[PDB]
């Protein structure tokens, strides 16, 4: 990307690549009062009261539709709020609007992760954030099918 230049030094050769400028910002960052009241508690507004740009564009796709989604973002781009919209998507079906309670036994939703140490970070987040619905998240040890309960 333009701005790159090479400094030739005696032992080694540097390549400096300049940092990218912030993008062209448009449309609207989605609002936290725009959520269904049952899922409004999952997103603490105090630090945000909005969604960042990455999670703002994926909204109508994710939370308003069932289609297949491939979301390619950078690192530290807030996966945990993204994929949790898709969680709240599938929770609405099995959710009873009349009584604020939920049907637990109907569904399973599976979150793959590349490493085991990176699993446990995710599990802590879904456990702390979604605890208000009485949803129990757990890692899968599955050893000798001892945990099938």
């Amino acid at each position: 990307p333009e701005g790159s230049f090479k400094r030739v030094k005696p032992q080694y050769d540097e390549i400096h690549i300049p940092a990218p400028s912030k993008p062209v910002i448009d449309y609207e960052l989605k609002e936290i009062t725009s959520l269904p009241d049952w899922c409004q508690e999952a997103f603490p507004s105090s630090e945000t009261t909005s969604l960042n740009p990455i999670q703002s564009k994926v909204f109508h796709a994710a939370f308003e539709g069932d289609s297949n989604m491939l979301i390619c973002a950078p690192t530290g781009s807030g996966k945990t709020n993204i994929a949790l919209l898709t969680v709240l998507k599938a929770l609405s079906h099995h959710y009873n609007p009349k009584t604020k309670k939920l049907n637990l036994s109907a569904f399973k939703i599976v979150y793959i992760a590349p490493l085991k140490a990176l699993v446990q970070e995710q599990v802590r987040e879904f456990q702390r954030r979604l605890a208000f619905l009485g949803i129990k998240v757990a890692e899968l040890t599955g050893d000798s099918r001892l945990s099938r309960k």
């Binding site: 030094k9 005696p10 105090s46 630090e47 945000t48 909005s50 969604l51």
Partner: protein
């Protein structure tokens, strides 16, 4: 009851006497080697300049040497930098390599060989040092007796051979110049004159070191006429030839005597007034591509070129040719780089760097060129002011002589003085140079001011400028060449700032407001916060992405702009406080900031953390805080709390980032008025400073690991904020004058400790060489100037009041020219209160009195002749005694009044027998005199009315040659010598009781009851104790300049300690500050003792760490000299503690500082550095 003084060298001596040409340090470039770079020394001082950028840059100034450098020559030795070989006082030959260590250039020593004894003394082999051009051997000489030759070698470490001696007993030596050689065997040539003989015969003598047998042989000895002046080496002629400058002609001589060629040196046409026989003072040789030519210059500055040509017709034998070049001002020494650039080191001031394009008139012309064909013939030329052959490229302003000066503007400390060869005024000030441009009238009564890059136009230079009034608030818009006017105007504005990007927030007393850009000129308000019950907001501060406000008393409120967007989320929760916040501060540079700072009306400061908030610290400070700021400077990363106060005291604090502690309190007192700081970002590497508004503005930057509050030439600025624009703006700053008038400025020079005084005001030479400077007694600073012609005796007078000069009457000219008068010494004196008179002494022994008339206001000056008065003596000194001229004839004092038709002698006093002349004199409140002598020391007098005479009461013990003399006080005196000493003399208390309890008429005759002892000293010693009392020497100290003026200042920049700032001949300013403590003088003492022998301590640790487990003994002092031995010199120092040695302690690495400081049971390094740095900040 003593007087303890502290010495600083404010501006270092600028007569550059030595130079050397090589490549010393590899700087900024991984691999680069180029012979273009030069090091220049003067006795104490030493500096390094670079070239090849086309213009001479300063790279480094090194630590203070404390010795007398008597020679310097680069030695470039085969198989590697070059390291300047440096011989001095201390009789050490010291080969020094300037090197890079820690982060800054240092001057590191390799080999210091012992020679003879420490002083500058005739036998000792220094003052002539010339080096084999290839680097085989150094050779030294003396005047008279011995000459040495050391034989250099390089290995894993540089190595010197034992010396090679020759001693010729009676021969005083002049001009040692050295012959290049192709590796044969090093030769050198001198002009020696015998000391004991009936007639003057000064003969040229060749020496050849024979490497084979290893001793110095005397090859040829030729007697030349007594006029001989200097020698120079002619390279090859392919038995080497030398060019010997006589008075009105040149020779060249071969060593074997085969050829002696005369070329009568050319001459000017005019030959003005006194005309010496001419001579030749410099003579480089620069050879390229068979082209052999040599630049050879004369007294008058004329510059000639020789070539030596085969003379094909006769045989192949030399032909010598003198032709003319550009000329220039006189040059102590000349050098030519491998580049075409030329460097001329001027003697009287202002060194230069030329490049020569033309390379002179060809050998062909028989018109303007002389030859060796017949020696008897003479050419005349007309010196060309055009300067065709050379080109200036560069200059360096030096004040080599400064014969007189005045102080103008005590508080910023400006010094007015002349410039010797240029003859233009030079005002040398301490402040921060602030240029003004495009002021504009603002409506009445503005207070603060702000600036924000304009969010409306994103990617445009436009910028919002805010003002505020107590009732009203004004706004304005900025772009290059376009400044126009344009968001709440009916309420006062506490704080306004930018948040995130493309947003604004304006806090006003009654309510907040949040703004955002819309389109171009329109700004909506997204929201407005309001106090819950209605309340006045006391103070509001902000960060980049963050915000704080404080209401009346109870609570504090916290905002954060939301990420990914533009929003303000208030808290929810708001903390409480004990008392009313007066003001607040948070760092505004970074997009998040820890540690708010809360202030009170109670008079203390608390700190706040952003777990979350907890009050981590307290400082209890005097008066209520008027204002405060917090700033982090990038380099050290130290986070500083800058606290103004009401009553004028300014303060600063180091802040801990993690803990929150307050340390390193730094206070100051600037003006009388509450302070109200403001903040900026500048250069000179990037930098930040916080100006301070008071009766006058103080900028308060920090250079590397010091910080210096200063003043600024603009009287005052009520608020100041950075500004960026075209016309190209760096350092540019906009502000509001105390008249309430918007204007722009560019802050230029800052006084770093390295320079500290910023000077302000083809080839430029004036014919009038200045003489003296005066000041009107009543008009506090309106300075008068007088010059003298070099030529037909003539004198010009030029006055200036305030900023810039005056016109003469209605004339064009800004000066007057008196004819047939030349001023030996002048003084302006008011015989009556309503007029001022001028007094000149011609050399003719006539005393002329003019009258000064300022128009006020045309304004212009007129000078008006009155009298002519005849005199016996030359009158080297006169001053204003009550109503009268007090003039000093050679022997005697004379006291003149004013009369019609002439001035007439109102009194006379014969002097006691010792005094032959009176070189200078000065008074105390019309009661007393002090009278210096050429040779004898000093005397005090008393004015006795009814006796109509002065009667001496006190004399001195030792012989001291005074140049200048003053009164710090009524019982004491400060002085100088021709030889560099600076001393203070106090009159004893035995004499103070008596002079206090009696009326002066009694001293001459009549009854004073003198103790038994004192009389018996008169009878026992009629010569010594004549007076009959003696000063007790009070201080004595040695500064190698010749001090011309002392100026006793009551204060420097509001400092409490009254200083006395002297100024020297070779150019200097220094000061003696009294230390008023008994506590400080102890500490400073301990620090002078620490740094004084450091080079000995390091060396003992090295020796003893080799014994069981900084190589040279003079490592830390770089030359051998002990300090006390140097600073003592003529006579031992008394109470003056050297503050320019104490100041090298700042320049050491931390390892070395903490090594030296281990010797003190007392405080740590940090506290030393505190103490040392205190003197420039608080005491001047």
């Amino acid at each position: 009851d003593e007087l303890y003084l502290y010495h600083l060298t404010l501006k270092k001596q600028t007569n550059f006497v030595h130079s050397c040409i090589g490549h010393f340090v590899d700087l900024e470039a991984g691999s680069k080697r180029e012979q273009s770079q030069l090091c220049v020394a003067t006795e104490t001082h030493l500096e390094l300049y670079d070239t090849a950028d086309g213009e001479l840059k300063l790279i480094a100034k090194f630590q203070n040497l404390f010795a007398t450098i008597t020679s310097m020559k680069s030695l470039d030795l085969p198989h590697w930098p070059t390291f300047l070989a440096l011989t001095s006082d201390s009789g050490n030959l010291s080969i020094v390599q300037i090197i890079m260590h820690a982060g800054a250039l240092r001057l590191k020593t390799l080999v210091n060989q012992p020679l003879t004894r420490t002083t500058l003394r005739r036998v000792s082999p220094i003052s002539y040092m010339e080096i084999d051009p290839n680097g085989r051997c150094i050779i030294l000489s003396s005047v008279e007796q011995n000459k040495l030759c050391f034989l250099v070698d390089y290995a894993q470490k540089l190595r010197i051979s034992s010396p090679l001696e020759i001693i010729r007993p009676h021969m005083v030596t002049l001009d040692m110049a050295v012959v290049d050689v192709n590796f044969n065997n090093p030769c050198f040539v001198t002009l020696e004159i015998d000391n004991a003989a009936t007639q003057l015969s000064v003969h040229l003598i060749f020496y050849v070191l024979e490497l084979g047998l290893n001793h110095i042989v005397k090859k040829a000895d030729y007697l030349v006429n007594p006029s001989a002046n200097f020698v120079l080496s002619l390279p090859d002629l392919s038995n080497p030839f030398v060019v010997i400058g006589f008075e009105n002609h040149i020779l060249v001589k071969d060593m074997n005597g085969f050829f002696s060629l005369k070329v009568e040196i050319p001459k000017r046409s005019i030959t003005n007034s006194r005309h010496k026989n001419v001579t030749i003072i410099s003579g480089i040789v620069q050879k390229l591509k068979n082209d052999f030519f040599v630049l050879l210059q004369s007294n008058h500055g004329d510059l000639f070129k020789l070539t030596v040509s085969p003379d094909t017709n006769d045989r192949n034998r030399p032909l010598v040719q003198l032709s003319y070049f550009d000329t220039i001002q006189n040059s102590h020494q000349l050098h030519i780089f491998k580049n075409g650039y030329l460097f001329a080191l001027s003697e009287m001031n202002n060194n230069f760097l030329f490049q020569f394009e033309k390379l002179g008139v060809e050998k062909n012309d028989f018109s303007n060129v002389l030859t060796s064909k017949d020696p008897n013939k003479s050419l005349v030329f007309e010196p060309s002011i055009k300067l065709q052959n050379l080109s200036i490229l560069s200059q360096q302003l030096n004040l080599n002589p400064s014969i007189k000066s005045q102080i103008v503007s005590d508080s910023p400390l400006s010094i007015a003085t002349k410039h010797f060869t240029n003859n233009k005024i030079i005002t040398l000030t301490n402040a921060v140079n602030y240029s003004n441009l495009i002021s504009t009238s603002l409506p009445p009564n503005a207070t603060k001011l702000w600036l924000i890059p304009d969010p409306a136009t994103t990617g445009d230079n436009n910028t919002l400028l805010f003002i505020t009034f107590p009732k009203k608030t004004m706004i304005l818009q900025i772009d290059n060449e376009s400044m126009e006017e344009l968001k709440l105007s009916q309420d006062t504005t506490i704080h306004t700032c930018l948040m995130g990007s493309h947003s604004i927030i304006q806090v006003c007393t009654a309510e907040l407001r949040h703004i955002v850009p819309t389109g171009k000129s329109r700004y909506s308000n997204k929201l407005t916060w309001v106090p819950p019950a209605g309340i006045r907001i006391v103070c509001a501060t902000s960060s980049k992405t963050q915000l704080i406000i404080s209401l009346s008393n109870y609570e504090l409120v916290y905002f954060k702009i939301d990420v990914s967007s533009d929003s303000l989320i208030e808290l929810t929760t708001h903390p409480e406080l004990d008392t009313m916040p007066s003001k607040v501060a948070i760092v505004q540079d970074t997009q998040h900031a820890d540690l708010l700072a809360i202030a009170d009306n109670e008079g203390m400061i608390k700190i706040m953390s952003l777990d979350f908030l907890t009050v981590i610290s307290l400082q209890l400070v005097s008066e209520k805080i008027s204002d405060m700021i917090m700033v982090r400077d990038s380099s050290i990363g130290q986070l500083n709390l800058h606290v103004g106060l009401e009553n004028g005291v300014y303060m600063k604090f180091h802040i801990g980032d993690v803990d929150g502690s307050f340390t390193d309190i730094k206070r100051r007192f600037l003006g009388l008025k509450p302070v109200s700081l403001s903040y900026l970002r500048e250069i000179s590497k990037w930098m930040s400073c916080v100006v301070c508004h008071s009766s006058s503005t103080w900028v308060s930057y920090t250079w590397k690991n010091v910080w210096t509050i200063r003043q600024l030439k603009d009287q005052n600025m009520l608020s100041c904020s950075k500004f960026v624009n075209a016309d190209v703006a760096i350092n540019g700053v906009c502000s509001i004058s105390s008249s309430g008038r918007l204007n722009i400025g560019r802050v230029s020079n800052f006084p770093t400790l390295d320079n500290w005084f910023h000077v302000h005001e083809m080839l430029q030479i004036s014919t009038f060489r200045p003489r003296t400077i005066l000041s009107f007694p009543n008009n506090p600073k309106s300075i008068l100037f007088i010059d003298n012609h070099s030529g037909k005796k003539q004198c010009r007078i030029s006055l200036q009041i305030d900023g810039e000069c005056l016109k003469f009457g209605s004339s064009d000219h800004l000066y007057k020219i008196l004819d047939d008068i030349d001023c030996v010494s002048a003084a302006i004196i008011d015989f009556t209160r309503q007029a001022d008179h001028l007094i000149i002494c011609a050399g003719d022994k006539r005393l002329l009195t003019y009258k000064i008339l300022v128009n006020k206001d045309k304004l212009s000056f007129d000078i008006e002749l009155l009298h002519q008065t005849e005199i016996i003596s030359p009158i080297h000194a006169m001053l204003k005694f009550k109503n009268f001229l007090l003039t000093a004839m050679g022997s005697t004092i004379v006291l003149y009044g004013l009369g019609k038709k002439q001035l007439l002698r109102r009194s006379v006093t014969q002097t006691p027998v010792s005094i032959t002349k009176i070189v200078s004199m000065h008074q105390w409140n019309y009661e007393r005199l002090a009278v210096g002598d050429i040779h004898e020391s000093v005397t005090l007098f008393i004015w006795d009315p009814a006796g109509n005479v002065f009667i001496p009461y006190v004399d001195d013990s030792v012989k001291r040659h005074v140049t200048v003399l003053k009164f710090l006080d009524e019982a004491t005196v400060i002085g100088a010598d021709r030889y560099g000493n600076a001393w203070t003399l106090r009159s004893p208390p035995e004499c103070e009781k008596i002079m206090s309890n009696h009326d002066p008429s009694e001293l001459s005759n009549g009854a004073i009851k003198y103790p038994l002892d004192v009389i018996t000293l008169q009878q026992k010693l009629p010569n010594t104790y004549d007076c009959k009392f003696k000063f007790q020497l009070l201080n004595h100290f040695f500064v190698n300049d010749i001090i011309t003026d002392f100026h006793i200042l009551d204060s420097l920049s509001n400092s409490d300690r009254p200083g006395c700032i002297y100024m020297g001949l070779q150019g200097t300013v220094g000061c003696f500050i009294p230390l008023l403590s008994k506590g400080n003088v102890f500490m400073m003492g301990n620090i002078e003792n620490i740094m004084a022998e450091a080079d000995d301590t390091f060396y003992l640790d090295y020796e003893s760490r080799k014994k069981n487990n900084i190589i040279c003994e003079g490592s830390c002092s770089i030359l051998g000299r002990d300090h006390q031995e140097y600073r003592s010199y003529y006579a031992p120092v008394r109470k003056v503690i050297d503050g320019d040695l104490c100041e090298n302690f700042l320049r050491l690495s931390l390892n070395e500082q903490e090594f030296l400081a281990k010797n003190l049971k007392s405080v740590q390094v940090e506290d030393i550095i505190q103490t040392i740095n205190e003197v420039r900040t608080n005491y001047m």
